[PDB]
């Protein structure tokens, strides 16, 4: 499987019993206590590039981790999980700062009181794909993919005043079909197009509707199935009309029915549950891959299709058999256990606590992490590779050059961003901006041996000068 992608996650942040604290200061402590060089923008909040090519920064009063660019959903899972470990370690380091704050971080999307914060997916696409096709084929997919992407939420309505359990944290915060907003009146399809790459070639699709997931299976499916649907849209393969009546209303109705029986009303007259509509996308994805590649499918594409179908089949049969794979099911299984054991109504405060603490990044206190520790969750990657991904970049995108430069020549890196690395060489009047405009250049295959040989940043900039249209574009 091959599509440039990345994940940004804004973390919930709590600093109890510290009247001096505010969210901006706490978020800064997290970013600053972990680490490197500063962000090249080409009020400046704390903002750092890590040696794995990721961005760690304060955004909207939350600490945010944005993965390096990766090429496939398994790598998306791996470097996104490295982000969780980085957050947990950052908070631990922040506790040793002079202020001494105990900072709690949550990989979730809401405080259940009316505030929401974002987990964004980014996908590189052909600029030539017409946006009206992107919108009309992705809205029904995004309305329904929460049946396996949802992280679960206790409380109904943006303000949480309705009693009950729902599939997704984000659904109640979405209000329109298409638009620019990310913090209010949120659109199912966000239209911002900032590829940090050649805008004549590329669109960057900025997806904001998904819940942050703990489960590696859920994140894998979220990114992998979306990438398969994007390939279909780019190629004009989808001839059916999947559009639904009142898609914002349907997003909320789907989330609010965890029995998975609510029926969407399609414009073409069909009436399908969210699981049924997802099965229609999966069947077209299978046909697309068969038509294009035959049995010559790469193993990851086959695995995404197989897991997508197996998940939808089990969801239609009995969703609780997925308690080792999906976040909302794993969470619901704990919630229903307490409801049974203690005769709790859905408004009980203990259920709100389980809903939130499921996403605590601490290995010893977060409930998802406790499930993993007891062997109650299926994993996609192993912990040794996660630890390696905290400090090493992917080999097959420009994040390789970015992260390895910081690791090897960090003292001489003035700044970096997704599309540049800026060197401060000793004796040089000026800064040297090395543009990294192509996401699939600056990889290990392009610069790994060069970086190996160079013993100084001055040697590297000498080797790279006049060679920008070789190494990076």
């Amino acid at each position: 499987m091959h599509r440039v992608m990345g994940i940004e996650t804004e973390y919930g942040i709590s600093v109890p019993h510290q009247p001096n604290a505010n969210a901006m200061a706490a978020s800064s402590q997290v970013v600053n206590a972990y680490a490197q060089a500063r962000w090249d923008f080409e009020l400046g909040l704390a903002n750092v590039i890590l040696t794995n090519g990721a961005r760690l920064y304060v955004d909207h009063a939350h600490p945010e981790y944005s993965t390096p660019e990766v090429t496939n959903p398994r790598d998306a899972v791996l470097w996104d999980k490295a982000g969780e470990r980085i957050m947990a370690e950052a908070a631990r380091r922040a506790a040793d700062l002079p202020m001494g704050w105990t900072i709690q971080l949550y990989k979730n999307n809401t405080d259940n009181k009316g505030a929401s914060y974002g987990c964004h997916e980014n996908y590189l696409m052909n600029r030539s794909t017409p946006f009206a096709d992107i919108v009309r084929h992705l809205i029904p997919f995004f309305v329904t993919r929460q049946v396996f992407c949802g992280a679960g939420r206790v409380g109904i309505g943006a303000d949480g005043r309705g009693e009950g359990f729902q599939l997704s944290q984000r659904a109640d915060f979405f209000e329109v079909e298409v638009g620019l907003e990310t913090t209010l009146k949120r659109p199912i399809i966000n239209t911002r197009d900032e590829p940090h790459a050649d805008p004549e070639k590329y669109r960057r699709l900025h997806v904001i509707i998904g819940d942050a997931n703990m489960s590696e299976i859920a994140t894998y499916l979220k990114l992998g199935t979306t990438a398969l649907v994007l390939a279909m849209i780019e190629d004009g393969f989808l001839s059916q009309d999947f559009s639904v009546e009142s898609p914002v209303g349907a997003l909320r109705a789907v989330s609010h029915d965890p029995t998975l029986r609510y029926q969407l009303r399609l414009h073409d007259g069909r009436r399908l549950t969210a699981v049924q509509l997802q099965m229609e996308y999966l069947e077209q994805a299978r046909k697309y891959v068969e038509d294009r590649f035959g049995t010559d499918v790469d193993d990851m594409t086959r695995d995404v299709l197989d897991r997508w179908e197996t998940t939808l089949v089990r969801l239609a049969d009995d969703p609780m058999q997925l308690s080792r794979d999906l976040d909302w099911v794993a969470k619901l299984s704990i919630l229903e256990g307490y409801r049974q054991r203690e005769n709790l109504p859905w408004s009980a405060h203990k259920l709100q606590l389980v809903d939130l603490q499921y996403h605590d990044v601490r290995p010893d206190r977060g409930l998802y992490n406790r499930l993993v520790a007891r062997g109650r969750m299926n994993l996609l990657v192993d912990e040794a590779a996660v630890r390696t991904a905290m400090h090493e970049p992917p080999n097959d995108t420009r994040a390789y050059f970015r992260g390895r430069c910081l690791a090897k020549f960090g003292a001489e890196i003035a700044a970096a961003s997704w599309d540049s690395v800026i060197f401060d060489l000793p004796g040089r009047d000026s800064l040297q901006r090395v543009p990294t405009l192509e996401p699939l250049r600056g990889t290990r295959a392009h610069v790994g041996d060069l970086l190996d040989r160079c013993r100084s940043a001055t040697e590297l900039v000498a080797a790279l000068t006049g060679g920008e249209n070789l190494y990076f574009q």
């Binding site: 804004e10 919930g12 942040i13 709590s14 109890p16 969210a23 955004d59 909207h60 009063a61 939350h62 809401t110 405080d111 259940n112 009181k113 505030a115 929401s116 914060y117 974002g118 964004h120 990310t182 913090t183 209010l184 904001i208 704990i334 256990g337 307490y338 054991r341 405060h349 203990k350 709100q352 606590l353 389980v354 939130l356 603490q357 010893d364 206190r365 409930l367 406790r370 499930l371 007891r374 109650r376």
Partner: peptide, 28 residues
Amino acid sequence: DAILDEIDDVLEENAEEFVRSYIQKGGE
């Protein structure tokens, strides 16, 4: 079951205070 005892071991103290105090700034 056994897993509800593991969860019980780690749940935040002062549950109602914790939930009421978990108030976030809006993000994206």
